[PDB]
Amino acid sequence: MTSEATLARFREYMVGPSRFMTLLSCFELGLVDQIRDNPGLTAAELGEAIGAKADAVEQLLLLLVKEGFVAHDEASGAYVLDGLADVAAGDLKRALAYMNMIKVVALRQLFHLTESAQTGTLVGLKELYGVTEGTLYGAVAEHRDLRDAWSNLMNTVTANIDPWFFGNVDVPAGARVLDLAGNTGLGAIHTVAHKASPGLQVTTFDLPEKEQEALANFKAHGVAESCSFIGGDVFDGVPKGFDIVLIKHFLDMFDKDDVIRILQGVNQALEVGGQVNIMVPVYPEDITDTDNYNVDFFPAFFIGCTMGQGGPQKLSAYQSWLEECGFKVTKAITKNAAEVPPDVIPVQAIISATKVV
Amino acid sequence: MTSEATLARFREYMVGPSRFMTLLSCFELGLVDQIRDNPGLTAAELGEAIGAKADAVEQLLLLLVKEGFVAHDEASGAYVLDGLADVAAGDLKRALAYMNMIKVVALRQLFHLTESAQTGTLVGLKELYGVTEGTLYGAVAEHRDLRDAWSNLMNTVTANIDPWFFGNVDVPAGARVLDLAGNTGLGAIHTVAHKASPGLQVTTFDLPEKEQEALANFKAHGVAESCSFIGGDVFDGVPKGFDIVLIKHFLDMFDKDDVIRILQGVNQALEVGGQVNIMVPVYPEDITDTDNYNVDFFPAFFIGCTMGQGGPQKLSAYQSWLEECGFKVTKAITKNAAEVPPDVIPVQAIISATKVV
Ligand SMILES: Nc1ncnc2c1ncn2[C@@H]1O[C@H](CSCC[C@H](N)C(=O)O)[C@@H](O)[C@H]1O
Numbered sequence: 201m202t203s204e205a206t207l208a209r210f211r212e213y214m215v216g217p218s219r220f221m222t223l224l225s226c227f228e229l230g231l232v233d234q235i236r237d238n239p240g241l242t243a244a245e246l247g248e249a250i251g252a253k254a255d256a257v258e259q260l261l262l263l264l265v266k267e268g269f270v271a272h273d274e275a276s277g278a279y280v281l282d283g284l285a286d287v288a289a290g291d292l293k294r295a296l297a298y299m300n301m302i303k304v305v306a307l308r309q310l311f312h313l314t315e316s317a318q319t320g321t322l323v324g325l326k327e328l329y330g331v332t333e334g335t336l337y338g339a340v341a342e343h344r345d346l347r348d349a350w351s352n353l354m355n356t357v358t359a360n361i362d363p364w365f366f367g368n369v370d371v372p373a374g375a376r377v378l379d380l381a382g383n384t385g386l387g388a389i390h391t392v393a394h395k396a397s398p399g400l401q402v403t404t405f406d407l408p409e410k411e412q413e414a415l416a417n418f419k420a421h422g423v424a425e426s427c428s429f430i431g432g433d434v435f436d437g438v439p440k441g442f443d444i445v446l447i448k449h450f451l452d453m454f455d456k457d458d459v460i461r462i463l464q465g466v467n468q469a470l471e472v473g474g475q476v477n478i479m480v481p482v483y484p485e486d487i488t489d490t491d492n493y494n495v496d497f498f499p500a501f502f503i504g505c506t507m508g509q510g511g512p513q514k515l516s517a518y519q520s521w522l523e524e525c526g527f528k529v530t531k532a533i534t535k536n537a538a539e540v541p542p543d544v545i546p547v548q549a550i551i552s553a554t555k556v557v
Numbered sequence: 558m559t560s561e562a563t564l565a566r567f568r569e570y571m572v573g574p575s576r577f578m579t580l581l582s583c584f585e586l587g588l589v590d591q592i593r594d595n596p597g598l599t600a601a602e603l604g605e606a607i608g609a610k611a612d613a614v615e616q617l618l619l620l621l622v623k624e625g626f627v628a629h630d631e632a633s634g635a636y637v638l639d640g641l642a643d644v645a646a647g648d649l650k651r652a653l654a655y656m657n658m659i660k661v662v663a664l665r666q667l668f669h670l671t672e673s674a675q676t677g678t679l680v681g682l683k684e685l686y687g688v689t690e691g692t693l694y695g696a697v698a699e700h701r702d703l704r705d706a707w708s709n710l711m712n713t714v715t716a717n718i719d720p721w722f723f724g725n726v727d728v729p730a731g732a733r734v735l736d737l738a739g740n741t742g743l744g745a746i747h748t749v750a751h752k753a754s755p756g757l758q759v760t761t762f763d764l765p766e767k768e769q770e771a772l773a774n775f776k777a778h779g780v781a782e783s784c785s786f787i788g789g790d791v792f793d794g795v796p797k798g799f800d801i802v803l804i805k806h807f808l809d810m811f812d813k814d815d816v817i818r819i820l821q822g823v824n825q826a827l828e829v830g831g832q833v834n835i836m837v838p839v840y841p842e843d844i845t846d847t848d849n850y851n852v853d854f855f856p857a858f859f860i861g862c863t864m865g866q867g868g869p870q871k872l873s874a875y876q877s878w879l880e881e882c883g884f885k886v887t888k889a890i891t892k893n894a895a896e897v898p899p900d901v902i903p904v905q906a907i908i909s910a911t912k913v914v
């Protein structure tokens with residue numbers, strides 16, 4: 201790879217921040233809605249509609265014309281949607297929810313990635329919110345803006361991927377299922393929806409503060425009889441007396457040492473023949489693969505923004521760590537990136553394993 | 558532009574901030590220096606040297622391996638420079654200085670681009686530095702981290718592009734030259750250095766609070782006899798008695814109506830045959846062009862980070878505005894593309910015009 205190709209790629213990297221917010225601000229300002237709802241307005245007409253100078257509107261829309269999202273008639277000054285014309289409202293809501301989460305959880309916090317990587321602490325959250333200890337997950341109880349941006353997304357990501365998950369995981373009649381780090385219970389609710397059987401019991405395990413929201417989630421989905429909540433810290437111990445443990449979007453938050461503690465805990469909580477089903481973003485075996493954006497996002501996201509440690513691993517590393525912790529792998533499935541909508545960053549693997557210890 | 562293609566481009570926009578800081582942090586941490594100075598070190602050894610966990614070093618370098626900037630040996634876990642190996646010391650220092658400026662001036666402030674666009678003010682600058690009104694240019698004097706990141710870098714890029722400017726502008730013997738928005742007089746000093754001739758007089762025109770810093774710069778560079786300062790607002794009129802007005806990196810700070818007012822003010826200050834020489838970033842006449850990164854960067858940078866208004870224009874726009882303000886264009890040039898390093902964002906134009914009123 202050339203020195204001049206390297207310097208060219210640096211420039212692509214340098215315009216990342218300005219590109220990201222130019223596009224998001226065009227949605228936040230209401231410009232895209234105005235252009236969709238009223239085809240053929242000028243910068244002056246759009247400016248009056250959204251409460252901004254026409255000259256500001258003109259400049260910010262230039263990048264959307266360059267990318268072919270929006271078209272501009274040179275003669276009239278008129279704007280219409282181009283690329284964005286045929287994007288379904290559902291697809292755009294998904295993408296904007298992820299972009300909003302990055303803006304709130306990552307954009308400003310990333311300034312302090314270096315200091316975060318040096319201390320193994322979240323300097324971003326320290327500087328912005330005055331949080332001195334722990335993770336984003338510990339702080340969202342106290343910080344409404346952080347909780348809504350992160351929670352709404354995680355729940356959209358989970359609603360979209362879990363049909364695939366439950367289609368590839370075995371939950372037999374009358375199973376006792378633990379959803380480890382199950383947040384406000386959507387994972388447990390999905391278990392009941394897809395695996396409804398007589399005697400089926402599902403429990404959400406997460407931070408004690410999630411309890412009231414979890415119980416209300418169960419009530420709202422009509423599954424309060426078959427779903428329950430245990431509050432705690434995974435590092436204090438995994439609840440005992442389950443047949444099957446689900447671990448969805450959790451192991452990638454942690455370095456090996458803590459992943460090993462989680463899986464050793466999960467082992468102690470299971471009988472021989474008890475099962476664990478893991479869904480986690482994985483790096484590909486060949487890191488140069490362009491169909492997988494996990495490495496372009498998560499290292500900086502976990503180290504600088506949410507944890508102060510962690511990041512995904514190759515499916516082979518997770519398979520190895522399960523084997524070190526007294527489990528035998530029965531399933532390993534990587535999601536086809538071309539079968540996921542092209543706006544979605546995470547590429548997940550499913551790993552199923554049986555305790556043999 | 559298809560729906561599918563639009564959503565894929567959204568994914569490319571979303572990973573921009575994480576990509577940007579992952580690369581910069583790898584330099585800030587000292588990981589690139591350690592890998593260059595000590596080839597074949599592991600993540601553990603690199604981690605001991607910089608004061609970060611091996612697990613953190615591993616995760617942050619993965620993206621550099623994906624891009625081929627750095628190579629990783631499966632067997633030994635050894636890191637060497639790849640793409641970055643043949644990149645000149647001087648090229649990297651320029652790239653890193655510009656990236657550092659974007660980190661300090663743009664990264665956090667862009668969070669508030671929407672609010673900055675609605676109010677015509679720098680909400681970022683207010684949120685972080687308590688600056689109630691005005692521009693990045695005003696706020697530099699009282700704030701050290703902005704001054705060092707932005708002010709120092711401007712001087713360096715000034716000195717690299719000034720030879721091309723003065724090499725393309727006609728300043729005959731005995732010329733009376735006004736440097737419009739000449740700041741603290743560097744532009745006037747550089748004019749004297751490049752065009753030294755019998756009877757050459759060069760005046761810096763800027764806000765009064767620069768008069769003292771300018772007079773001292775002239776003394777120190779030994780050009781007090783050739784260079785003076787005149788304090789004023791350009792919108793209250795341009796000083797008379799000048800043959801040539803230089804306008805470098807000023808016009809892009811304003812919207813059309815204000816640009817017209819400056820060019821009319823310059824026209825009123827000149828006799829028929831008086832000359833103006835503008836240097837300004839330009840948008841390409843075909844805005845879809847990928848060699849020109851001005852639209853990916855400047856709309857958000859001006860509106861969100863530096864001015865709360867303004868931005869570049871097409872060279873054709875600036876030429877039409879000069880002709881509207883009683884000027885005849887004699888020269889309109891861009892820099893030889895091949896002589897511009899591929900890391901450099903701003904595409905510069907020079908336009909020369911003669912008052913014909
Ligand atoms: N020490 C800890 N013990 C238990 N849960 C924890 C934890 N640290 C973080 N968590 C939880 O881990 C979850 C990670 S996000 C994943 C949520 C859910 N499994 C899903 O896939 O949608 C959050 O709900 C967070 O509160």
Ligand SMILES: Nc1ncnc2c1ncn2[C@@H]1O[C@H](CSCC[C@H](N)C(=O)O)[C@@H](O)[C@H]1O
Pocket residue numbers: 694711715737738739740741744762763764789790791792805806807
């Ligand atoms: N209304 C106004 N009248 C005169 N100078 C102004 C002005 N508004 C801003 N300025 C000046 O515009 C300058 C822009 S700094 C960059 C321009 C400089 N000629 C260079 O090439 O480096 C600042 O020095 C600022 O003080």
